[PDB]
Structures are given as C-alpha cells and as structure tokens.
Design a protein around this ligand. Sequence first.
Ligand SMILES: CC(C)CC(=O)C(=O)O
Ligand SMILES: CC(C)CC(=O)C(=O)O
Ligand SMILES: [Cl-]
Ligand SMILES: [Cl-]
Ligand SMILES: [Zn+2]
Ligand SMILES: [Zn+2]
Lengths: 334, 334
Amino acid sequence: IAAQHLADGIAASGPAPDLAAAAAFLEMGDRLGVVAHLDPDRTLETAEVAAALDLPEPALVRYLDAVESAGLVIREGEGRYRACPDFDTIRHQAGYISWTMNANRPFIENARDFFTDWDKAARTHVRDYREVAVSSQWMGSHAFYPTALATIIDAAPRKVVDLGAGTCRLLIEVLGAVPGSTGVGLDFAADACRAAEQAVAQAGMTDRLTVVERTIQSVATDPGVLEGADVIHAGFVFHDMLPEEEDVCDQVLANCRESLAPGGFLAITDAVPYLRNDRERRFSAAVSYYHGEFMRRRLQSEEEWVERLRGAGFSDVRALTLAFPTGRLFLAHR
Amino acid sequence: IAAQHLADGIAASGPAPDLAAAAAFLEMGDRLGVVAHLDPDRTLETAEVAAALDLPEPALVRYLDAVESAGLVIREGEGRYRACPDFDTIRHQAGYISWTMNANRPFIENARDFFTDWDKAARTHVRDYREVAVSSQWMGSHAFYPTALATIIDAAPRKVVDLGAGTCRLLIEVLGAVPGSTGVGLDFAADACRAAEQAVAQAGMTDRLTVVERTIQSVATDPGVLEGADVIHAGFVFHDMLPEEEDVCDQVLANCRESLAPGGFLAITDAVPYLRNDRERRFSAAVSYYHGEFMRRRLQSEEEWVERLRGAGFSDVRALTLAFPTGRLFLAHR
Ligand SMILES: CC(C)CC(=O)C(=O)O
Ligand SMILES: CC(C)CC(=O)C(=O)O
Ligand SMILES: [Cl-]
Ligand SMILES: [Cl-]
Ligand SMILES: [Zn+2]
Ligand SMILES: [Zn+2]
C-alpha cells in the first residue's frame, strides 16, 4: 500500500521539491550577499566572506552546511565551499521562481486592492527593484543574454550603444570580444552608472566605453550619442514607456534608424503577450498578466512590433524566438 | 546561432518557467478565494463566485482568462471555467514552491536578523499560519495524506483519535470508509474547532465524531479521550513540542501506548533531518534548515524516533518512507 503510494507520490511531486528548495536557498543566500561568492570553479573561504559580508562566521558556516546537505555546494576542507558542477543551471531555473514569487510578490498578496483601486494599489504595493534585477539576470543567463551577446559580436561592430545598460556587463563583454570596438552605456540610475564606471576601469575600457547618466526618453530630443552605431541594443526597456509615452517611444525608434551606420541594426529583446503554444503559454501568461493587469505596461505582439519598427523607417525586421518563454529578439535593419 | 541557443536555453530552463507561473497564479488565486472553486470535474460560474468572494466580476474574469491562456483552466462558454484535467497535480507541485517561497518568506528575507538576535527576530518575523496550512495541505494531497488515510482505513478501526485534527478532514474521510467507526478530533484553535463541528454536521457524523478544543500537551495530564482507540494519528505535530517540552512529549507518547486497545497503533508522520540520498536531499535540507535554524524545532532521525517510541512502551515500530521528501510514517504498535 505504502510502496504504491510512494512511487505515485514521487511522480506527482516531480521536480517541484528540488526547485522549491533551490529557489529558497538561493534567494536567501543572494539577499545575504553569499550567492555572488559561489561558483563551480573556485571556493569561497568562510573566514574572508563572513568579514566581507559583515556576517558571524558560525552562522555563515551553518548556512553553507545546509546548502551542502542540499547538494548545492561541496565542502572542500574546513572553511572552503565550492558550488556544485551544475550550479549555474540551478541558479538560472531559480530565477523564474524568484521573479514570479519574490519580485512580483506585491501583486500576488494584494490583488484584491489592485482590482478595487488600481491607482492607490500601484503606489502602495511596490516591487523591490533589486529583486526584479537579480531574478531577471538569473533568467537571462541561459534564456536571453547569450543570444543578444552572440548576435552583437558576430556583426563585428565598430560602435555599439546599449539603451538601459545598467552596470554595462553586456557592453564590457562585447568589447572584450571585438578588437577596436567602442561602446556607449546609457542608463538613468546614478547607482548603476557609478558601478558601470568602476567596472569599465577594472576591464580597462574607459577610453573605449563611455557611460552617460540619462533616460531612454532623452534620446528622442537629443540623439547625438547614437550617431554612427553599427548595433543599438535595447533589452526589455521599450514596454516600460507604453502605453503612456507612445509618441516619445516612436521618436526614439525613428532616431535609432537614422543614427545607424550603413548596414547597422537595432536589436530589441521584449516580451510578447499571451502565447498559446504549449511550451511558452504558462510563463507567457504570468509575464503578460503581471505587465497588463498590475503594472499597466503594454506588451506588443510580433506583428505590432514589426509594424512599429517599419513605421520608424527600418527596411526589414527579423523576429527570433528566445528560450525565455514569451521573449522575442527583433533585429531591425536600417 | 539563435537555434542552437534556443534548444540549449529550453533544456537549461526545463520545467522552472511552468512551475514558477503555476505557483504564482495559484497562490494569488488562493488568497482571493478562487482556487477553492476550481476543480477538473465542474465549472465555476463567475457571476456567482464574484458575489460569493466579494470581487468585481470583470476583474475575476480577467484573472480566469489569464489562467486560461496559461492552460490551468478551460473556458466552457461565457462565465464558466473548469480546471485543466491535471490541475490537482499542478496544485500539489505548487505547494512545495508556496511552502518554501511564501509561507517561509520571513526567514528568506530576514536571515541576517535571525543570525544576529534570534529571540528578537523570531518574535518580529512571523509566518502567516494560513499560508503554512494551505501550502502543507497542497504538498500533502499527493505526498503524505493518501498514505496515512489508507493505513488508518485498512486497519478497520472501531475508534480513531486525531491529535491536531484541524478541520477534521482526515477523520471525516476515515469514518465515511469504515462503517460504525467513531472518532475524536483534538485541536487547540477555536477557529479550526468551529469549522470542524460544522463540517461533521454536513457529513452527518455528529454522534460518531466528537471535536474537543484542547492542546496536544493536555493529553499528558488528562489522557481520557484516548482510551480504547485502535488508531491514534499525529501528523507533523510532535516536533513543535521539541526541544523545549521533551518531558511532556514523552508522557503524551507513554499515555498513547497505554490508552490503545489490543493490537492498536499510534501513526506519526514527521520530518527527519538532513537526508543525503539524491531524491530527498534538497528539500530535506530546506525543511531541516527552516526548522533547526529559524524555528528551533527539533526534527528527529528514524533511529531517534524508534528509541523514543520504544521508551514509551511500544513493542514494535515500523518506519515507512513517504513521497514527501524527508517525510516518514512511524507505526508504533502497542
Ligand atoms: C526584465 C524582464 C525579464 C521582466 C520584466 O519585464 C519586469 O520584471 O518588469
Ligand atoms: C506541516 C509540514 C508539512 C511543514 C512544517 O512542519 C512547517 O511548516 O512548520
Ligand atoms: Cl535612407
Ligand atoms: Cl502490557
Ligand atoms: Zn517589464
Ligand atoms: Zn514544522
């Protein structure tokens, strides 16, 4: 009786216990600053990491021994832990869970308020931008960042502009692979711009990569920084301007097309709404419902994106399916 | 380039996007009261469910259309939705995610406080008991509740006592399958006891099933209600008394053994700490770390449980592996 109930229960639970445990351990560890020190090819030394993160070393060791028991890290002698061989895949998968269950938690917990008075709910139940950013990065590691990276590099560009560059991690990697290429990181957050400037100095690309503290919307009035770019990148940034800033968005796209060097392209990664195919539908619906219902940010279909980009003067647009469910890469050629 | 990155990304994400979306939709819907109306064998009528849950019907319809796009429900004509055929398995799997990421969220977000001043953190960062209860029920549906149910029924008992019966859902189902059997639901919460009393009246078992509002600990001093029971059930309740009430716990177990009718048994379901086998280790570590580090509730190994139950006078103890990772069923024969 109990053996039959055992196999059937194991099949019914499937991979959910493992993913549930991985996501909780990794979100907890990431908030503590520990996950950044975990890597499959090197150890973290507890005596040093506890001092660097201002944590009591015995508490850090109890956390690392629990994650070791979980199989997420390997104890390599006293006070040294290495991430398990497939850690980066586990962290990638945890990113989806973290994004839906942690970053978007204000929407899960207060839906009744958003249904009653959206304007009051939207200003009261605010997402933690750090959690949105980290969970997005983890989802991106294996499901959208490699495609955008390889597309920009294989074009062998002389000048690359990244709209919403953050800490300029993509631009630093593109310049390291393309000799003599220059870049321009555009981002409004002062915190992200200061961090980007110190990361370019470490990479040795201060002369090659310029960081500008300004909005995506300012590119509509002042497009100078875009001139002569072979590639312009815009990762999940345009839907934040829609539907309230449609005219500014269209002037930014028209300015991107005219600014491009001959043969240059604009590469936009964005989420398309409510797909029906079996692989993408579930996560597509969560992405779409969070954007449409809770954030009131307009996601455009492929057809809409192509119509808008051709309206901006782009001669041809190619849409590519990304592994990120509901994610599409649009390459708009000048 | 993008096709290779597509297949590799799909393999790296695996089932995480689908589980992340299912868990968020189901937690959101459960907090709204909607998930209780979703079942694969019948429709929910939006006009009635919106009035019963005091929700605007257009907001409920937008929620149900998003979950329909997700494949979790089927629209059966205007204003009627049915859960997808495998909904109960999806909800079961979501229970693990909900338990680690939602119910235990105070521990994820405030770990640094628990490491600095546990006593202050434990009284400040409190779990939502409703979320602990619902997520536990969803995990139990396919991973521990069927085994306990079938074990109690196949014993064909005359009297069953449930220690920590809640709304007496297990006892109502055991009495419905065993003719002439009587039951005693023991639970401290007044809210759970009132709900249990109205559920036994609906089932037509008021004379057969008695509900008592009292603690598990009171059974140590006053064991009368236990007399002549063929089966006593105790689902994940004993570790809440450890390590601070070890002597009371032992007197409750000794009283269970003496109270049993000849051939009777005590059935305890509980979590064992930090297993190393590949299937159970990850979720075992999250269960164990939340209990040991954050809640300071002692989980006992199988060896410890058997030693404690034999110390209570039980002649033989059998341990059975449950599908719930780190869950064990202990049958202690009088
Ligand atoms: C950056 C995306 C991956 C997610 C998104 O658009 C959001 O969290 O608002
Ligand atoms: C009831 C269990 C499944 C989980 C538990 O022991 C808890 O949440 O404290
Ligand atoms: Cl032209
Ligand atoms: Cl005896
Ligand atoms: Zn967004
Ligand atoms: Zn517990």
